[PDB]
Every structure is written in structure tokens, then in C-alpha cells.
């Protein structure tokens, strides 16, 4: 069972420098007197790592509390331990560290190691209550206070302890590397006696492999398991803990790095070099030796990657007579519909959506958000004053009086149905009966068919002969549009837009995103559909009025005409080149010089 401790209070982070450590055997092969280059997850040289006291006394009173934050686990972790009295005991791994996601424990008592992955319920301060015996004291008893409960256990492993016993300055360094790739939880280990060095010692030490585990879980966050020698019920004034946590543990974060490892005739890594540190090391990696002679070598290449984007594209003056339809005065009757044609215009569909004024927004065949992007060939517009409960019947694949008798909607409908009301504008106190609606027809219609005939339908067997009477009715009845009618009986201004997507030239297109102009900076540019990377400079060339572009002798674009501003701009590809290192023999000096071929010294 877990016992609550005091707050961590978010102690400030502290940094130190790691000098050539974390070098572990990257594979399981034997190499003798050879230089091998490996690209994998490692600790950078002279990298800056975060170090925590096991116990800190930060309060003015002298409160002894642990430095046990839960730290992020990204692409492996290097964990160093300078310790003397066996106070760090294990590690927790997972994503949530709760009863929601599977979590892994490694713990080390005096006898063996225990490794599990289950559904643990983890407390805020897991720890191990460690106490000595009253007679022997040779070993210690550990009471686990790490998790509340465990379920769905999927692995178990017990073997020789990872940490050796430490039972007055023989502090030792345990260097560990933990990685997770392809369901593989790998631990590489090494221990070394240290003397009179508070931080990591300077030197090299190969880290041998210790175990691989097929846990196969997702792990993003981890914590450090530590041991209470004291009592949480009665915290002593001082010395109840272990020398106020002089024992320390260091955390470094691994990255994909390249290393040149030198295997000797033993197959022990006696030296390594990282290729990304400094140009001297880059030269050593590219030449595949630890010593370079006096001369000049070429290591890599730079390209000056662009920093932003620009797009310009001309906008036509006239837009559309959308306001002639949507904001019209008089509308058509439902028996004699008003199709309107829209072509050779730029259609602003952001206006209709941002209007936040139309009740129904249902576009079929085209997503609502993308009307301005893609454009079409021809547009047909209809907009009417239909009753409210007859709104849902304008979408293809439907049944209803209007949906069956008046106007068919083909299933393969690419377009939009967008509706709202017309109460304050199309209703009158005496009722607006100028809209005539059909309820009787001889047969159902076809998609996009129009009938305006006013023939009297024969409900019975005798012919009407255009004259009403028994079993004879006029085709059209008028609606009682009143401002006091209920929601369904209200007048409803509904719009149907039918678009044409054909293998034909496009005459209607959407609004075009045009941005600001940037000069003398490498940028990705899109002029009238031409996309590229370059730096745009003011050009003296003169274009004839009907010309737009310019090419060199070698079929490469070099000059362009800005559509909005009639200036003429020329393009230079963004400066790149090779990088060379001038260096004398490594046996004489370790300083180098860099030379960038065929570029100007401003972009560097």
C-alpha cells in the first residue's frame, strides 16, 4: 500500500555536462581492429544533462524530501547513478501510470530482480520502505509501497540483481541505457568504481548489454524508485536519511546520432567519435579514420532551406450576381421555377456560410468547406418560399408531395440545399396567397423537369374538359402565409444550387487566397499556379504586354510578372553549396577552419 508524502513544490531544474559516456555496444557482433560507423539512438557528447539529488534538504527548517519527478521518456533514456548506500531501487515505465494503460516495473531487492508489466494503480509517491534487521544488518528488508493493485499481468522475469550491494567514499557509477524499439525493452549496463568525482568522470567506458525484453507496450513517461531508510510517520530533524541525499542520479536524453566506434584487437570499444559535434569530428567521420593529415577535405553540403511561403494570383473586379438572387425582391412560384445561370464569374461561397443566416446547410457531392477551393463549369440557382415541414423534402432520395409531384432531385446530386425563413418579408397579415402549389398530377416527373400547365386533373372517371366540378380540381392551391403561423407553416426561403463538374473549361471559380509580398528572402512562391523555391529580386527586364513568364537558354524559368502589381520580378534559386574543412594533422592541433564553396557570406 502507498503512503502520501509532501509536495515536490517543483524544484528548479539543474544542469551539468556529460563527457563522452553512454557509449554502448550497438549490436551483438565481434569486430577486431576496425572502424565501424553506426547510426542509432545514443547520448550526445558534451551534452547537457539533468541531475537530481536522491534526498534534498531545501527548506529553511531542514525538510528532507525526495527528488522523484516523473520524467518524459523519448526514444530511450541514459540513466547514470553515482551512489554509495543502495538507495535507488527500481524504475516505472508507461504512458499514464494508472489503471487505464499497461505499465512496467523493474525493482531490485537484496536477492534478485523483479520485472512485471500489468495494470498497476500507481500512487503519487511510490517508494520502497527499507529497514535493517535488529541482529544481522548484512542485508535489508524492503516493503513495496509502489502500486495499489495490479491486474492483467502479461510478463514476469526474475534474475540476478541489476544493482550490486553497496554496504567512506567508495561511491560507484552505474551507467544504464534503456531503449524501446519494435516492442523491445532493451537494457545495456555497466558499473565502474569512481573516486573523488562529484559529476560524471571524464573518459570512456564501454557499456555492455544486459537484457532484452519482449514487453511490447507503449511507454512515454517514467519515474525513479527510491528507498526510505527513515520513517515517514516520524521524520527526524537530521541524519535520519542518508547524508541528505549526497548520492545522485543523472538523466540524459538520447537522439538519433552517428558514431564512429573503434574496435580494437580485443573487440572492446576503446574510443568513439560523434559526427555532428564539430567540423573536426565531421571530417574524421567522412574520412573514416581517427587521424587526418594536413590538407583540405569536403564533408557535407548546405542548402539554405526557405523560411516562409507566398502566393499571389489576380482577382477579377466583378464577382457574381449572387446578391441578385439571395437578396432579391420578388421570387418565383413553386409551379413555375426560376433557374438562373451563373458563369464567367468568381463565386464567393464563404459569404453564404459566414452569413450565419440560413438554417439548413446541406451540400451533397461537395463538402461545404471546400466550395471556394474547387471550381466548376456552370451554376444553376433556385430559391423559393416553401413551407417549413416541406424543407426536408429537398434532398435527393426522398418522398413527399413536393418531392414526388413538383420537382425531382436526382440521386447523383452535386450541389447544395441551404435554407432559412421568409417570415417578415414574405408573410402578410391578410395572408400571402400568390404562391400556388400542386397536389394532384397524372404521373411523377423526371429530374430537372418543369411543368407549368394548368389543366384540371380528372380525379374520377368522367373528363373535366378544362372545367372544374365533381372529381375535378384546379392544379394549384395557394398557401396562407401569415406572420402568426407556426414554425412548420411559416414561409421558408430555401436555395438549391446545382453545379456542373465536367471535362469542360471552367468559367466559375472560387475566391483566391492572395498574400503579401516578400523580397530578397528565400521563399516558396506560387505565381499563377507555378510553384517553386527562390529569392525574388527587382528586375530591369521589360516584358511585352502579352507576355507573362521568362525562360533562360536551358529551359529554366527566371523572370515573372506579378499579376496585382505590374512590376517584373526575377528569381534566383536559393543559394546552396558544399562545405569544406581545412585542418592540419590531428597530432599537431585540434582546431579547424570552414569554407563554404560558391555562396555569399551573408546566408551563413
Amino acid at each position: 500500500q502507498c503512503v502520501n508524502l509532501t509536495t515536490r513544490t517543483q524544484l528548479p531544474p539543474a544542469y551539468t555536462n556529460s563527457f563522452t559516456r553512454g557509449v554502448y555496444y550497438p549490436d551483438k557482433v565481434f569486430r577486431s581492429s576496425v572502424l565501424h560507423s553506426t547510426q542509432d539512438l545514443f547520448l550526445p557528447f558534451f551534452s547537457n544533462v539533468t541531475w537530481f539529488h536522491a534526498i534534498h534538504v531545501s527548506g529553511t527548517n531542514g525538510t528532507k524530501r525526495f527528488d522523484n519527478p516523473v520524467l518524459p521518456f523519448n526514444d530511450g533514456v541514459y540513466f547514470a547513478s553515482t551512489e554509495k548506500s543502495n538507495i535507488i531501487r527500481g524504475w516505472i515505465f508507461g504512458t499514464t501510470l494508472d489503471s487505464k494503460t499497461q505499465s512496467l516495473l523493474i525493482v531490485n531487492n537484496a536477492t534478485n530482480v523483479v520485472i512485471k508489466v500489468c495494470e498497476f494503480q500507481f500512487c503519487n509517491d511510490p517508494f520502497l520502505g527499507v529497514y535493517y534487521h535488529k541482529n544481522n544488518k548484512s542485508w535489508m528488508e524492503s516493503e513495496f509501497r509502489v502500486y495499489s493493485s495490479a491486474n492483467n499481468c502479461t510478463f514476469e522475469y526474475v534474475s540476478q540483481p541489476f544493482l550490486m550491494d553497496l554496504e567512506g567514499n567508495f561511491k560507484n557509477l552505474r551507467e544504464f541505457v534503456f531503449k524501446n524499439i519494435d516492442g523491445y525493452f532493451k537494457i545495456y549496463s555497466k558499473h565502474t568504481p569512481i573516486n573523488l568525482v562529484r559529476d560524471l568522470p571524464q573518459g570512456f567506458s564501454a557499456l555492455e548489454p544486459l537484457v532484452d525484453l519482449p514487453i511490447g507496450i507503449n511507454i512515454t513517461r517514467f519515474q525513479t524508485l527510491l528507498a526510505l531508510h527513515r520513517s515517514y510517520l516520524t521524520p527526524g530533524d537530521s541524519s535520519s536519511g542518508w547524508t541528505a541525499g549526497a548520492a545522485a542520479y543523472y538523466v540524459g536524453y538520447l537522439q538519433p546520432r552517428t558514431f564512429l566506434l573503434k574496435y580494437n584487437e580485443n573487440g572492446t570499444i576503446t574510443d568513439a567519435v560523434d559526427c555532428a559535434l564539430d567540423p573536426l569530428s565531421e571530417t574524421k567521420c567522412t574520412l573514416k579514420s581517427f587521424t587526418v593529415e594536413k590538407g583540405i577535405y569536403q564533408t557535407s553540403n548546405f542548402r539554405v532551406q526557405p523560411t516562409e511561403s507566398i502566393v499571389r494570383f489576380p482577382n477579377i473586379t466583378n464577382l457574381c450576381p449572387f446578391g441578385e438572387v439571395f437578396n432579391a425582391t420578388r421570387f418565383a412560384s413553386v409551379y413555375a421555377w426560376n433557374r438562373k445561370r451563373i458563369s464567367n464569374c468568381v463565386a464567393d461561397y464563404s459569404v453564404l456560410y459566414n452569413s450565419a443566416s440560413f438554417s439548413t446547410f446541406k451540400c451533397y457531392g461537395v463538402s461545404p468547406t471546400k466550395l471556394n477551393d474547387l471550381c466548376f463549369t456552370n451554376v444553376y440557382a433556385d430559391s423559393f418560399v416553401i413551407r417549413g415541414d416541406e424543407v426536408r423534402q429537398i434532398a435527393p432520395g426522398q418522398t413527399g408531395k413536393i418531392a414526388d409531384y413538383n420537382y425531382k432531385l436526382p440521386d447523383d446530386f452535386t450541389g447544395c440545399v441551404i435554407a432559412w425563413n421568409s417570415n417578415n418579408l414574405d408573410s402578410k397579415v391578410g395572408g400571402n396567397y400568390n404562391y400556388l402549389y400542386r397536389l394532384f398530377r397524372k404521373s411523377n416527373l423526371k429530374p430537372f423537369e418543369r411543368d407549368i400547365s394548368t389543366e384540371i386533373y380528372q380525379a374520377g372517371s368522367t373528363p373535366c374538359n378544362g372545367v372544374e366540378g365533381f372529381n375535378c380540381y384546379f392544379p394549384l392551391q395557394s398557401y396562407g402565409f401569415q406572420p402568426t403561423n407556426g414554425v412548420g407553416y411559416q414561409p421558408y426561403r430555401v436555395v438549391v444550387l446545382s453545379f456542373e463538374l465536367l471535362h469542360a473549361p471552367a468559367t466559375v471559380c472560387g475566391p483566391k487566397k492572395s498574400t503579401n509580398l516578400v523580397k530578397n528572402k528565400c521563399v516558396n512562391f506560387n505565381f499563377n499556379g507555378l510553384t517553386g523555391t527562390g529569392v525574388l529580386t527587382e528586375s530591369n527586364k521589360k516584358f511585352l504586354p502579352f507576355q507573362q513568364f521568362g525562360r533562360d537558354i536551358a529551359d529554366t524559368t527566371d523572370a515573372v510578372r506579378d499579376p496585382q502589381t505590374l512590376e517584373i520580378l526575377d528569381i534566383t534559386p536559393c543559394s546552396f553549396g558544399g562545405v569544406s574543412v581545412i585542418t592540419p594533422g590531428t597530432n599537431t592541433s585540434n582546431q579547424v577552419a570552414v569554407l563554404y564553396q560558391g555562396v555569399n557570406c551573408t546566408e551563413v
Epitope: 443566416s357 439548413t360 446547410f361 417549413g388 424543407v391 432559412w420
Partner: nanobody, 127 residues
Framework: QVQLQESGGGLVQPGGSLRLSCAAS????????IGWFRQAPGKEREGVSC????????NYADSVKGRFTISRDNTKNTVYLQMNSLKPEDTAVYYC????????????????????WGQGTQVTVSS
């Protein structure tokens, strides 16, 4: 396939509390504002409480202020309300309407078209 469904109606005591929810299937409800309306026996359908598409703008009738709380979850696509201290004047049929505002403003004070309507549920307060 646009469908609106009520959940949580029933019989309670005056002064009590209950929670009603409108769920929906066939389309997403984050774009729509959703209002709650009620029809009393012999009375017209009144506006009980409206909430915007993003939930930042809300409307309560003067008779329902301080007892009703409207809310929505756009992630799971439902709209909730909590009524406390119920009265016999609140027993009626109850509806959820999802639509888009019709005028140039952010609030939802006024009424407009009521795009999609569920079948409703009965809320009864009597003791």
C-alpha cells in the same frame, strides 16, 4: 439520416431536479446552435433555452432563468440541460431543435427557423 432523440424525460416532484439530453445521429452538431422548446397542454410552443454553435452564447426565457442550466458537448455531439426546483408550470411536451441563427449577431435571444426537430419527450411535475 439526420435524427434527433430525447433522453431523460419523466415524472418528478415540484422543487426537484432532473437532466434532459438531446442526442443525434446522421450528422454533427458542433456547427449548429441548439435550442430547447416546450409545449404545455393548451399552450403554444415557447422558447425555453438556446445555446450557440460554440456554446459561448446562451438564452433563457425570463420564466426559466435561475433554475435551468443549458450546456452542450461537441466532442460526443449531444446537448444537455439541468433543471432544479421544478414547478407545476413546467409539465409539458419538450423538444430540441438544432439550426443556424438567421441575423447578424452572436447571441440567440431571438427566434428563427428551427431546422431539425426530434420527437420530443414528456416532463411532468405534480405533487
Amino acid at each position: 439520416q439526420v435524427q434527433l432523440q430525447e433522453s431523460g424525460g419523466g415524472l418528478v416532484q415540484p422543487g426537484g431536479s432532473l437532466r434532459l439530453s438531446c442526442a443525434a445521429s446522421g450528422f454533427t452538431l458542433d456547427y449548429y446552435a441548439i435550442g430547447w422548446f416546450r409545449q404545455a397542454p393548451g399552450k403554444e410552443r415557447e422558447g425555453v433555452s438556446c445555446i450557440s454553435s460554440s456554446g459561448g452564447r446562451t438564452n433563457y426565457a425570463d420564466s426559466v432563468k435561475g433554475r435551468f442550466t443549458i450546456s452542450r458537448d461537441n466532442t460526443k455531439n449531444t446537448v444537455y440541460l439541468q433543471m432544479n426546483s421544478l414547478k407545476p408550470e413546467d409539465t409539458a411536451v419538450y423538444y430540441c431543435a438544432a439550426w443556424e441563427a438567421s441575423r447578424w449577431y452572436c447571441p440567440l435571444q431571438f427566434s428563427a427557423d428551427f431546422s431539425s426537430w426530434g420527437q420530443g419527450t414528456q416532463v411532468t411535475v405534480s405533487s
